PDB file of C-alpha atoms and ligand atoms in Angstrom:
ATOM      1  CA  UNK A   8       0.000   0.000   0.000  1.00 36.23           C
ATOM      2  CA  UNK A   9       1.856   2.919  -1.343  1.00 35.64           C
ATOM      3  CA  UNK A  10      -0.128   5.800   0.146  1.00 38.82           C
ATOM      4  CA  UNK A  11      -1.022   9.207   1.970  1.00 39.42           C
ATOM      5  CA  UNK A  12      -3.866   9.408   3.866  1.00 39.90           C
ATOM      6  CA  UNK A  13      -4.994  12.625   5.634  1.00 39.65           C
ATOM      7  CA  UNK A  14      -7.924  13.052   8.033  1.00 41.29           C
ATOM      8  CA  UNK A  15      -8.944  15.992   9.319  1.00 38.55           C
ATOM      9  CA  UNK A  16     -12.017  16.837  12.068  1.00 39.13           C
ATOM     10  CA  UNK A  17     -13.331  20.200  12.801  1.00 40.95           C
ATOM     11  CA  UNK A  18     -15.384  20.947  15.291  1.00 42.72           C
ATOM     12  CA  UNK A  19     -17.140  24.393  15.590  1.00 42.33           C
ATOM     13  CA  UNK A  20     -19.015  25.547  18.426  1.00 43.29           C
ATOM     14  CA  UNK A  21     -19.625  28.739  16.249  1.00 42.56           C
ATOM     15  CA  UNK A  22     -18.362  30.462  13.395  1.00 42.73           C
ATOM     16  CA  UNK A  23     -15.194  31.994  15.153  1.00 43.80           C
ATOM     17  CA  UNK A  24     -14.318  29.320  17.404  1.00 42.29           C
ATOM     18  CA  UNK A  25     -12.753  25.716  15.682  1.00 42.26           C
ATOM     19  CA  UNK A  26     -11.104  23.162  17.513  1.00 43.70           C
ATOM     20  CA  UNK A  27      -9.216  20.615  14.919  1.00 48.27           C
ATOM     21  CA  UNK A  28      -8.165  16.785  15.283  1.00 49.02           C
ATOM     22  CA  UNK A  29      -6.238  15.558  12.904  1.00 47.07           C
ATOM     23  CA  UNK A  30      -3.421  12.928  11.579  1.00 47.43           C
ATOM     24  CA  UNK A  31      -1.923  11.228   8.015  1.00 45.51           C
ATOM     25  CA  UNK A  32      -0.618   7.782   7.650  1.00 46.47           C
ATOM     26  CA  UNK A  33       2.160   7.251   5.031  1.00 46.30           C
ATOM     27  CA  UNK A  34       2.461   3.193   4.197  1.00 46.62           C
ATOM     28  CA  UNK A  35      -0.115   2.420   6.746  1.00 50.14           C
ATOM     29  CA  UNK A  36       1.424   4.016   9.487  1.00 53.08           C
ATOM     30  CA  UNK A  37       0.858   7.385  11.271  1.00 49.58           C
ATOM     31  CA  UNK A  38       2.912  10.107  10.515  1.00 54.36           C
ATOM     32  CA  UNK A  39       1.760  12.973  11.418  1.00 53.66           C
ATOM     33  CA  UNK A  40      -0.650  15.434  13.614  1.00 55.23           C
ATOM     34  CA  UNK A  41      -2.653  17.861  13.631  1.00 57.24           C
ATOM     35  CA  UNK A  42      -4.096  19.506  16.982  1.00 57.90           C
ATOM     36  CA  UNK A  43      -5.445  22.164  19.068  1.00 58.97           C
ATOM     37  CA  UNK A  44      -8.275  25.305  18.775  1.00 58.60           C
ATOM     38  CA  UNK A  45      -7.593  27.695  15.283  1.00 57.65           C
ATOM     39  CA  UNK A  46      -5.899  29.803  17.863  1.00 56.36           C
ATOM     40  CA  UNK A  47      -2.921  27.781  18.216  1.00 59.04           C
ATOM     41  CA  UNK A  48      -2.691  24.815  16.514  1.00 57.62           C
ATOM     42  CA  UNK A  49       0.232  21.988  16.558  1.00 61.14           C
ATOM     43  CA  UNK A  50       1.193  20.396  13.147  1.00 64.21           C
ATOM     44  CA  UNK A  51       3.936  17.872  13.388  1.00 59.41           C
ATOM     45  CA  UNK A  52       5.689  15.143  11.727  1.00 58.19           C
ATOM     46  CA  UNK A  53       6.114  12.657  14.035  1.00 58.02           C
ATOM     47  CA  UNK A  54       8.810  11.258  11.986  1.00 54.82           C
ATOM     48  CA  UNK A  55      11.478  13.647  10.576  1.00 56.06           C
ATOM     49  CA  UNK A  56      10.838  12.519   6.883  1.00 53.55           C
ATOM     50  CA  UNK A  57      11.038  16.038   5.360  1.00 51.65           C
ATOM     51  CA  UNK A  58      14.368  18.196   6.609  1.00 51.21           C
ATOM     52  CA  UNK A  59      13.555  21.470   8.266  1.00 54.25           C
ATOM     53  CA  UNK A  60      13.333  24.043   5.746  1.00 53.87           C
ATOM     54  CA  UNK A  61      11.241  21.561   3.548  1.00 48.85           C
ATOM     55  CA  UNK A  62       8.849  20.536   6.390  1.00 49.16           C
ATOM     56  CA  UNK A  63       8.613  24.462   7.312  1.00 47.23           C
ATOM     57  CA  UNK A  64       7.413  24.906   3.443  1.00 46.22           C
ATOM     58  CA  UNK A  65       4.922  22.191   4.321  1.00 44.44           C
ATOM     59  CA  UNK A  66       3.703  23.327   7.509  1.00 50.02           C
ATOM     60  CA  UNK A  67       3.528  26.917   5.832  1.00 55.69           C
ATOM     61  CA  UNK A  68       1.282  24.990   3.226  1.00 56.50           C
ATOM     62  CA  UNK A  69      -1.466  23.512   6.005  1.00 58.41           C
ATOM     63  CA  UNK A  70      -1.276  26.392   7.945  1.00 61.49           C
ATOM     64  CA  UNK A  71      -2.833  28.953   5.083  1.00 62.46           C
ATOM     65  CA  UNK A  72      -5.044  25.719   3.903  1.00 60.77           C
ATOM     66  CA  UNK A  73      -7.051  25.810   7.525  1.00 57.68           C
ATOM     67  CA  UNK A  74      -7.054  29.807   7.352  1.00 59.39           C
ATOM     68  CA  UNK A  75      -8.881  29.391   4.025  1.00 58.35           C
ATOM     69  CA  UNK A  76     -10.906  26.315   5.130  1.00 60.15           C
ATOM     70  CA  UNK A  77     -11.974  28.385   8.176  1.00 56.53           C
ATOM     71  CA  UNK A  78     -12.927  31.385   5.902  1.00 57.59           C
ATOM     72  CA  UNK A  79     -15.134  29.217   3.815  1.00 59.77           C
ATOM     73  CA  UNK A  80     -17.320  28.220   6.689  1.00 59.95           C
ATOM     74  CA  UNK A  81     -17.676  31.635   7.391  1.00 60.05           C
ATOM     75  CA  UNK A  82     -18.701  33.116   4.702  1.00 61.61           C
ATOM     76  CA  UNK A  83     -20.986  30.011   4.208  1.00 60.22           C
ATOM     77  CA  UNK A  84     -22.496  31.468   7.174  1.00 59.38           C
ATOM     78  CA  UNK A  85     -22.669  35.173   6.981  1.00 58.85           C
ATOM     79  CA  UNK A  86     -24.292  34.089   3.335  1.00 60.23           C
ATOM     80  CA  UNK A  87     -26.605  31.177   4.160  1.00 60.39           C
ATOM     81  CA  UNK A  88     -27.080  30.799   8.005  1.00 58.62           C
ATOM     82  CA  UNK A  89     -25.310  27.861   9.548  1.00 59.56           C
ATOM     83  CA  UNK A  90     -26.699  25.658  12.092  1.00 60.31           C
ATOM     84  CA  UNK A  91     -23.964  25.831  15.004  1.00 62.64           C
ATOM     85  CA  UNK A  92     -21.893  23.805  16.403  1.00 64.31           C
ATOM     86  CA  UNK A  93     -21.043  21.232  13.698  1.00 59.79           C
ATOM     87  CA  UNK A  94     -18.369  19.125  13.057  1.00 60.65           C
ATOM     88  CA  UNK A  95     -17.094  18.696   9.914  1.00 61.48           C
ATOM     89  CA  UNK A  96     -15.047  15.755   8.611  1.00 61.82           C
ATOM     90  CA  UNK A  97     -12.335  15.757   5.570  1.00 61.81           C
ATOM     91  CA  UNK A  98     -10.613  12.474   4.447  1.00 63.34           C
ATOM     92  CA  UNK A  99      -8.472  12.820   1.344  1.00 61.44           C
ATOM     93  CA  UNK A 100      -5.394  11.528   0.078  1.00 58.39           C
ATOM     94  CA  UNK A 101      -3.458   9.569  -2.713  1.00 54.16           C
ATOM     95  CA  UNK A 102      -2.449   6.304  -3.886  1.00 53.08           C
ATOM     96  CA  UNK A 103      -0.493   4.169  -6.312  1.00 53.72           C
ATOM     97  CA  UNK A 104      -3.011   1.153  -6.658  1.00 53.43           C
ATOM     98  CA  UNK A 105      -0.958  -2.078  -7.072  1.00 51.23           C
ATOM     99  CA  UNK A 106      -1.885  -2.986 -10.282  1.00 49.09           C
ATOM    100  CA  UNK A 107      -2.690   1.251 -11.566  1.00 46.41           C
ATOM    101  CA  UNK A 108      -1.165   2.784 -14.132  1.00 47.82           C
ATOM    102  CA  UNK A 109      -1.850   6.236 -12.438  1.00 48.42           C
ATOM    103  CA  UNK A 110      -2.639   7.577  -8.718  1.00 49.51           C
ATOM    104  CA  UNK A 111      -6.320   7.510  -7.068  1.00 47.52           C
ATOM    105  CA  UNK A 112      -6.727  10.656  -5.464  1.00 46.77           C
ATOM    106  CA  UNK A 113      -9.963  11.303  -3.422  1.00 47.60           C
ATOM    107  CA  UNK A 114     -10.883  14.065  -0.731  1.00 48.35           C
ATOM    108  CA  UNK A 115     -13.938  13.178   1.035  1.00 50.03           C
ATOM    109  CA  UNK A 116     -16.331  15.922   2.777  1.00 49.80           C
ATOM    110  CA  UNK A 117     -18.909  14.831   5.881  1.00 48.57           C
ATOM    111  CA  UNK A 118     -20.569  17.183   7.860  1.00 48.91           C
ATOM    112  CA  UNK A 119     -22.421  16.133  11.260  1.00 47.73           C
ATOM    113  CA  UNK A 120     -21.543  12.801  10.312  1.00 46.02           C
ATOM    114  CA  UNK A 121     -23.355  12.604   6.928  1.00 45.90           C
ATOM    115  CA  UNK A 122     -22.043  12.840   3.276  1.00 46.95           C
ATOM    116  CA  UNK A 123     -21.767  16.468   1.873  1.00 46.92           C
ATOM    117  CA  UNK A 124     -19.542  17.437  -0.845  1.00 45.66           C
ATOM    118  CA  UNK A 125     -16.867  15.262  -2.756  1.00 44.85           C
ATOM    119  CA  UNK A 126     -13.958  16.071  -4.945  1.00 41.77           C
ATOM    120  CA  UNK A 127     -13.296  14.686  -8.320  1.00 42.65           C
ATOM    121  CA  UNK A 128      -9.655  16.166  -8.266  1.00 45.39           C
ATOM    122  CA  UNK A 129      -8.875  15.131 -12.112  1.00 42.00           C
ATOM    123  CA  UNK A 130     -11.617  17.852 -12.905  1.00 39.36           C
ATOM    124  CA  UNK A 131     -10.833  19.681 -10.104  1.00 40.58           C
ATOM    125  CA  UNK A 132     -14.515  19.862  -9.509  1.00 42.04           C
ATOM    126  CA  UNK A 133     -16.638  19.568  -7.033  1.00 43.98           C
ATOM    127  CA  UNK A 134     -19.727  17.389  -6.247  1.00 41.88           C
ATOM    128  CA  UNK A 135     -22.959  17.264  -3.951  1.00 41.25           C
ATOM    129  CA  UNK A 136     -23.038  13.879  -2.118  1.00 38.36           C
ATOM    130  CA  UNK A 137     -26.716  14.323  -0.232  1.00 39.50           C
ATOM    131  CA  UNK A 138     -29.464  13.689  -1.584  1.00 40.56           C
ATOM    132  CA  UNK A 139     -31.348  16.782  -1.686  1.00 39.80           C
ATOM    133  CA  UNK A 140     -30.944  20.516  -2.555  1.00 39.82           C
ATOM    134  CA  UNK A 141     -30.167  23.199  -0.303  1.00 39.73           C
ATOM    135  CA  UNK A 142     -29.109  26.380   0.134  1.00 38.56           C
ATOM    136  CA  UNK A 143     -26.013  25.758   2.155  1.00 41.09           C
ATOM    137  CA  UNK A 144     -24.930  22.830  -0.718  1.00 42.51           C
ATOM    138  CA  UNK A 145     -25.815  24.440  -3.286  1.00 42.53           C
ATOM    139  CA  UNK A 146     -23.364  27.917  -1.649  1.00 42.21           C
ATOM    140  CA  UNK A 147     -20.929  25.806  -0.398  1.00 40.23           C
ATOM    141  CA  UNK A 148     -20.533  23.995  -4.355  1.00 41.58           C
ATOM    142  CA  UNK A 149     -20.946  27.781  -6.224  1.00 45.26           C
ATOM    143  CA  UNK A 150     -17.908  28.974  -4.064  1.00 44.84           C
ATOM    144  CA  UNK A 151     -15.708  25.814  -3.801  1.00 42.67           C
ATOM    145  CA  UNK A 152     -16.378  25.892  -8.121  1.00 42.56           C
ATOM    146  CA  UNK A 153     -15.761  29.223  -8.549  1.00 41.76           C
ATOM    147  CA  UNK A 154     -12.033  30.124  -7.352  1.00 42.87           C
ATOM    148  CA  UNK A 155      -8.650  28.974  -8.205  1.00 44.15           C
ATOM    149  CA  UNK A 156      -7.768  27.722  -5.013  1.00 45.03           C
ATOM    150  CA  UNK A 157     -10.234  25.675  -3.837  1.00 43.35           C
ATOM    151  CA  UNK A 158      -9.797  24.339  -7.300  1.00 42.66           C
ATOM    152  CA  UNK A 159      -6.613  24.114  -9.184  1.00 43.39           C
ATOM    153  CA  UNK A 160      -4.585  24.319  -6.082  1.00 44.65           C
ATOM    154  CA  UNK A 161      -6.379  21.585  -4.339  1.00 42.00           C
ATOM    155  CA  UNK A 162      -5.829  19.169  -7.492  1.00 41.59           C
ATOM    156  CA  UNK A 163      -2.544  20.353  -7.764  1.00 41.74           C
ATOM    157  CA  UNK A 164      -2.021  18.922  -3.904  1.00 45.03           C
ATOM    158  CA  UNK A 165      -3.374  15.614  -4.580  1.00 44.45           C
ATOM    159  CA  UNK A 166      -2.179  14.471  -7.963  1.00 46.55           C
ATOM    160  CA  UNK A 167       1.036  16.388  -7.835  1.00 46.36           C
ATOM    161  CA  UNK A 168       2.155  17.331  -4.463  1.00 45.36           C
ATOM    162  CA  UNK A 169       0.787  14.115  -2.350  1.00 45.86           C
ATOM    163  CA  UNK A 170       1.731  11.805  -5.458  1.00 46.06           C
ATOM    164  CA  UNK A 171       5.541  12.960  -5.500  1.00 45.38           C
ATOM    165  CA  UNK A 172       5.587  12.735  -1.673  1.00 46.74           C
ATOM    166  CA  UNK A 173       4.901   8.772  -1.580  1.00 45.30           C
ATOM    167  CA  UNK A 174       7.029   8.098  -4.324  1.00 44.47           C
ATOM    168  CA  UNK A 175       9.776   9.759  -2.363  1.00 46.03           C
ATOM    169  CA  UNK A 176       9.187   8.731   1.044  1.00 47.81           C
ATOM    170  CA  UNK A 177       7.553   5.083   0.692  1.00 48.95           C
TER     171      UNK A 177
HETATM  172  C1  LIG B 201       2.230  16.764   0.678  1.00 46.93           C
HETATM  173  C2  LIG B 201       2.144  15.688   1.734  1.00 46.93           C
HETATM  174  C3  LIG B 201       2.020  16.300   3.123  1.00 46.93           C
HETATM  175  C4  LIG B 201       1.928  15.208   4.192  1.00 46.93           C
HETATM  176  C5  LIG B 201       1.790  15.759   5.608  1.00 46.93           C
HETATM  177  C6  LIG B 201       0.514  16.568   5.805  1.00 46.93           C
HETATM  178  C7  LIG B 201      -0.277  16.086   7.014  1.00 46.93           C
HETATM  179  C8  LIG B 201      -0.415  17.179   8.078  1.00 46.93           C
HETATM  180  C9  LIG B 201      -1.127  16.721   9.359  1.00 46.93           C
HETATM  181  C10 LIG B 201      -2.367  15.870   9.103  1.00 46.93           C
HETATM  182  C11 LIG B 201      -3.639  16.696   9.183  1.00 46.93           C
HETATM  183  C12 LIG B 201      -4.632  16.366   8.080  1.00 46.93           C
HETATM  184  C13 LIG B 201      -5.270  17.628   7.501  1.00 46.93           C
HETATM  185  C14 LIG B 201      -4.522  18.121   6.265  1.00 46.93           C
HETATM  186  C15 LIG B 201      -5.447  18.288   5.064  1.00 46.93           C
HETATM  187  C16 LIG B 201      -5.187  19.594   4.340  1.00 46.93           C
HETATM  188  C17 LIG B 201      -4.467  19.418   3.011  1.00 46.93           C
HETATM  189  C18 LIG B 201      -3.415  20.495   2.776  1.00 46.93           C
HETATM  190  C19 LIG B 201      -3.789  21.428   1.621  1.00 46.93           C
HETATM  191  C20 LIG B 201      -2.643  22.269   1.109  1.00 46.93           C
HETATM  192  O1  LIG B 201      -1.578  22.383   1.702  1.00 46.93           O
HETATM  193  O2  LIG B 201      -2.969  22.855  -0.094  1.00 46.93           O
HETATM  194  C21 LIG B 201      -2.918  24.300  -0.276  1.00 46.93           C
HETATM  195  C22 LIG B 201      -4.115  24.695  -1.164  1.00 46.93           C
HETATM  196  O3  LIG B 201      -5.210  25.240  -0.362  1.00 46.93           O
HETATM  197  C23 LIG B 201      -6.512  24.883  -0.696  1.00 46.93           C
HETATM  198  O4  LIG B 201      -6.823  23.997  -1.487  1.00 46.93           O
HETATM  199  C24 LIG B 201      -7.558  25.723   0.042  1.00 46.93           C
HETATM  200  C25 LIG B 201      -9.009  25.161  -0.008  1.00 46.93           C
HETATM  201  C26 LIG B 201      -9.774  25.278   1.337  1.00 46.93           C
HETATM  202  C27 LIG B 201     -11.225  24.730   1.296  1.00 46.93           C
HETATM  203  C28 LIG B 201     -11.356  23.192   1.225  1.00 46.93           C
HETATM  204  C29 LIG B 201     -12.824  22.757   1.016  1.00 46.93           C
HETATM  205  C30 LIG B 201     -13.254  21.508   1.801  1.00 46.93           C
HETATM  206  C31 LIG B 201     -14.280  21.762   2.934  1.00 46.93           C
HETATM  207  C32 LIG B 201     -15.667  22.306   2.513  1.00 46.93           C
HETATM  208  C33 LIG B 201     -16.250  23.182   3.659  1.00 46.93           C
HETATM  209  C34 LIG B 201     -17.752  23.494   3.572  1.00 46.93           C
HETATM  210  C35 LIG B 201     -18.297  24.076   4.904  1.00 46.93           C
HETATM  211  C36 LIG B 201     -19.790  24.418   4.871  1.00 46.93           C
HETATM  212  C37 LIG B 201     -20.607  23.618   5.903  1.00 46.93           C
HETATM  213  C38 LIG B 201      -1.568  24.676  -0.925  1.00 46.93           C
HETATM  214  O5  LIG B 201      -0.812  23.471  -1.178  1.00 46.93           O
HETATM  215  P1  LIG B 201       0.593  23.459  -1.952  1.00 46.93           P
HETATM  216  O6  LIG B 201       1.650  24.401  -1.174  1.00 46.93           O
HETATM  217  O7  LIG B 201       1.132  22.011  -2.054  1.00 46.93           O
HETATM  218  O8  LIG B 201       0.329  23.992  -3.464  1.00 46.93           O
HETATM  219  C39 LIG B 201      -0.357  23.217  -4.483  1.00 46.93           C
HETATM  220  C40 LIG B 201      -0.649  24.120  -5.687  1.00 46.93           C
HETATM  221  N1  LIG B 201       0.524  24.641  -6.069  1.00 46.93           N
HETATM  222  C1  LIG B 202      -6.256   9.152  12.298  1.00 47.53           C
HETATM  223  O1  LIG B 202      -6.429   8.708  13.653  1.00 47.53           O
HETATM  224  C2  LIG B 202      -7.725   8.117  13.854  1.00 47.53           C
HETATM  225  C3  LIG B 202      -7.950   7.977  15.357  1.00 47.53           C
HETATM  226  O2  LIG B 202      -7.036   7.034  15.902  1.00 47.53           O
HETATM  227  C4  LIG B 202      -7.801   6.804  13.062  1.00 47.53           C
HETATM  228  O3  LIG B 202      -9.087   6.182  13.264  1.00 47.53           O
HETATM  229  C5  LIG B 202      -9.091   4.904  13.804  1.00 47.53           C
HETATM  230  O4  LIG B 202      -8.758   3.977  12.760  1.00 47.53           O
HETATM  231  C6  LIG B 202      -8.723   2.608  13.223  1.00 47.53           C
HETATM  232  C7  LIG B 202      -8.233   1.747  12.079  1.00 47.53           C
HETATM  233  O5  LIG B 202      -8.828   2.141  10.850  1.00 47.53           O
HETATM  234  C8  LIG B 202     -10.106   2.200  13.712  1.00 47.53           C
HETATM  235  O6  LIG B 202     -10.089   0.843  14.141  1.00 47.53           O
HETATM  236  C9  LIG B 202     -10.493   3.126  14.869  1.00 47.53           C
HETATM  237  O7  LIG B 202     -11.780   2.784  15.371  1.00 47.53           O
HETATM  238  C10 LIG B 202     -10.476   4.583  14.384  1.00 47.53           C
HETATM  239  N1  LIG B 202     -10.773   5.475  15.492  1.00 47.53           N
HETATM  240  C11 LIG B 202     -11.526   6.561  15.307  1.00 47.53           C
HETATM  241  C12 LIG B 202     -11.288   7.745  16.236  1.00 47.53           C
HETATM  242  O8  LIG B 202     -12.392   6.639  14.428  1.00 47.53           O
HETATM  243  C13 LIG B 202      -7.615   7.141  11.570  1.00 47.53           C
HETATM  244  O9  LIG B 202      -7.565   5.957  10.804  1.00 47.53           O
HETATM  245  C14 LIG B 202      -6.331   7.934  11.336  1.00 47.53           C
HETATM  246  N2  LIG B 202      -6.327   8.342   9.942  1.00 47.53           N
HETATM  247  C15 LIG B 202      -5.189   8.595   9.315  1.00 47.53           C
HETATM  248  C16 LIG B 202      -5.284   8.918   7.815  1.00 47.53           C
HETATM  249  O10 LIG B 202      -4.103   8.616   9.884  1.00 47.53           O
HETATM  250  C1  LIG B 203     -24.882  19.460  13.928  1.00 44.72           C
HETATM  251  O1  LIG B 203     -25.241  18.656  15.060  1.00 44.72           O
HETATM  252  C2  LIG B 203     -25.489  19.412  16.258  1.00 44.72           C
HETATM  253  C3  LIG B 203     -25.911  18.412  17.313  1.00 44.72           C
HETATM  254  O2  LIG B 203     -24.796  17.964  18.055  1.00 44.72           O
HETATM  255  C4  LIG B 203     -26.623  20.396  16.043  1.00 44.72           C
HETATM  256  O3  LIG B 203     -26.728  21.227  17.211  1.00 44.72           O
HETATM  257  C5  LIG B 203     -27.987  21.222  17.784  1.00 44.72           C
HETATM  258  O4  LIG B 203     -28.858  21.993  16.948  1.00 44.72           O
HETATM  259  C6  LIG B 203     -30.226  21.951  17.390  1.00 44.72           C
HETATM  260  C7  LIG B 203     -31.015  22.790  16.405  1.00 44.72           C
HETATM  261  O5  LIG B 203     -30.535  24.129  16.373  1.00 44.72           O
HETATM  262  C8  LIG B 203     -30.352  22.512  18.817  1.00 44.72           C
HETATM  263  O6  LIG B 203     -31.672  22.269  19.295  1.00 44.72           O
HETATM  264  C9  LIG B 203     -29.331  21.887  19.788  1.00 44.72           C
HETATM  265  O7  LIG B 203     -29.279  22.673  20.968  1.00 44.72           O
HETATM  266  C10 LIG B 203     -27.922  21.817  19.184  1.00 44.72           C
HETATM  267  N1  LIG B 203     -27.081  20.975  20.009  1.00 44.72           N
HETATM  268  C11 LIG B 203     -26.089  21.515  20.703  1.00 44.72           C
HETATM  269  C12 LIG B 203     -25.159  20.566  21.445  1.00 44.72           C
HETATM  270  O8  LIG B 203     -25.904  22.733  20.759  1.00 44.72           O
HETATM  271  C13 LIG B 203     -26.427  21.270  14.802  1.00 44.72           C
HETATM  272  O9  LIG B 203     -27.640  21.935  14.504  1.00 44.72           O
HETATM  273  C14 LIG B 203     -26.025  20.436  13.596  1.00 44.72           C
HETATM  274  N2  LIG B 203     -25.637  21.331  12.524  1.00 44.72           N
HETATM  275  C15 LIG B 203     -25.837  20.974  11.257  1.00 44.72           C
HETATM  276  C16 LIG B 203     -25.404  21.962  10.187  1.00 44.72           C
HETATM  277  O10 LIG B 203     -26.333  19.891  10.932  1.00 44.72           O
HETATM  278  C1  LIG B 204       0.298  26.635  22.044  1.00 42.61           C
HETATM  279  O1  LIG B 204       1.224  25.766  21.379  1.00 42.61           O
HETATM  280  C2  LIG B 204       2.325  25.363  22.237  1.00 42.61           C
HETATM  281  C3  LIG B 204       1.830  24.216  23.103  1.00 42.61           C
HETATM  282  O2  LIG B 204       0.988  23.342  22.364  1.00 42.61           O
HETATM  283  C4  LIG B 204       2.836  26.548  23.077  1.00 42.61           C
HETATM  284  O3  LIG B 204       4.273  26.458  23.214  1.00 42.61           O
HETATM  285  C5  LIG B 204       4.877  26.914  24.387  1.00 42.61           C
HETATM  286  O4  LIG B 204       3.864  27.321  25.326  1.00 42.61           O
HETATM  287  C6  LIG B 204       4.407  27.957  26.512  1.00 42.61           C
HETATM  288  C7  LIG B 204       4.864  29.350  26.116  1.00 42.61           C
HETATM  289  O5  LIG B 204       4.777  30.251  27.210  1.00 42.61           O
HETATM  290  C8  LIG B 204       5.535  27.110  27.125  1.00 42.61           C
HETATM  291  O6  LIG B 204       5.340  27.005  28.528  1.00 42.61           O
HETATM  292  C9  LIG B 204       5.564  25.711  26.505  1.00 42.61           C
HETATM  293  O7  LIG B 204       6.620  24.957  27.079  1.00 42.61           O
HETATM  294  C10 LIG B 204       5.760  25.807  24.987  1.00 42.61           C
HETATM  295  N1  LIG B 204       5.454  24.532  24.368  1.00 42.61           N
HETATM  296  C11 LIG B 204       6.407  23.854  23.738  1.00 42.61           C
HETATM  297  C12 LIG B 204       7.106  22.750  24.514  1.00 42.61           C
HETATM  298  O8  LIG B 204       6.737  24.090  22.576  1.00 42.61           O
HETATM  299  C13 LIG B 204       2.456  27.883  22.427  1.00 42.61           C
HETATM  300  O9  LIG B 204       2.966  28.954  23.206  1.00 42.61           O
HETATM  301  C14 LIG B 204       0.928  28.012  22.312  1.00 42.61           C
HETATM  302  N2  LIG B 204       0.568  28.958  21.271  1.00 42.61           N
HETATM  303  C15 LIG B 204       1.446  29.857  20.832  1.00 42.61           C
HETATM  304  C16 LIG B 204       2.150  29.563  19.517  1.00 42.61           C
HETATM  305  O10 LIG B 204       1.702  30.893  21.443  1.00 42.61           O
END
């Protein structure tokens, strides 16, 4: 199993307050953490598989990818009204199947416990995984859509960035 898998849990009690849990596994086995409120949070490798300056790049990378996450759920809010506190759930990561002839990306988004939104990273698009309609979907899929970074950066993470970090490190 040659691959990086990322979860991430956050839990807001209200739009301004987020408390995140969250680890990867590289191979199978954990390698990293993430931890604490959006006030101070603790991201660590608990391996030293990247050298300083490269793991301070990386870190530098998750830090302004929570900021942004965080500012989504915001403005999904000050647009659409959120029901507070919720807990929302991202699994994503990358992987060069054993018999593939190219890397199955996937990021995965639950909220409250319950399918939301998906990824389809190839397209860098995004997709409704409920059932229904709704206001805060339908929001939450015109913004992730509409910008470059929730977008091309994100695909650029999984099938470049996460892809070239297994083949190095596995
Ligand atoms: C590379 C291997 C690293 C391995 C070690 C990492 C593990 C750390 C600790 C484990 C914790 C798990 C949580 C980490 C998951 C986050 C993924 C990081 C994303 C990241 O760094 O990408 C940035 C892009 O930002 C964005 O894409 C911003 C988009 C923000 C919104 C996301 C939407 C989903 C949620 C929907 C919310 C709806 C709410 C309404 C109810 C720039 O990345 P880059 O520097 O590589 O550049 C690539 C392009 N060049
Ligand atoms: C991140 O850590 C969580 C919590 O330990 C892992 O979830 C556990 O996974 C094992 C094996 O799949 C299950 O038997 C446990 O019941 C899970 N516990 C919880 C809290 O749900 C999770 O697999 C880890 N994910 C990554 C990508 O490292
Ligand atoms: C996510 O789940 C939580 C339940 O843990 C929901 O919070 C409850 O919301 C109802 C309706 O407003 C209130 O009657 C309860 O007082 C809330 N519980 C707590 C612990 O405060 C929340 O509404 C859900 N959010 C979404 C978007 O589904
Ligand atoms: C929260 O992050 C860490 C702890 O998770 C804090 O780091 C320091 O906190 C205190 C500073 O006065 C020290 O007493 C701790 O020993 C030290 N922790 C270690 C061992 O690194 C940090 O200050 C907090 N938030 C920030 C960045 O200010």
């Amino acid at each position: 199993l040659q691959r990086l898998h990322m979860l991430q849990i956050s839990y807001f009690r209200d739009p301004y307050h987020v408390w995140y849990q969250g680890n990867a596994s590289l191979g199978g086995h954990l390698t990293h953490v993430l931890e604490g409120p959006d006030t101070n949070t603790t991201i660590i490798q608990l391996q030293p598989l990247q050298e300083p300056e490269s793991w301070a790049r990386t870190q530098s990378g998750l830090q302004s990818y929570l900021l942004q996450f965080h500012g989504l759920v915001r403005l999904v809010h000050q647009e659409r009204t959120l029901a507070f506190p919720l807990t929302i759930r991202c699994f994503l990561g990358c992987e060069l199947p054993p018999e593939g002839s190219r890397a199955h990306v996937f990021f995965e988004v639950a909220v409250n416990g319950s399918s939301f939104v998906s990824f389809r990273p190839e397209r860098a698009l995004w997709q409704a995984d409920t059932q229904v309609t709704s206001g805060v979907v339908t929001f939450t899929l015109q913004q992730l859509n509409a910008y470059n970074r929730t977008r091309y950066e994100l695909r650029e993470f999984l099938e470049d960035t996460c892809v070239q970090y297994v083949q190095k490190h596995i």
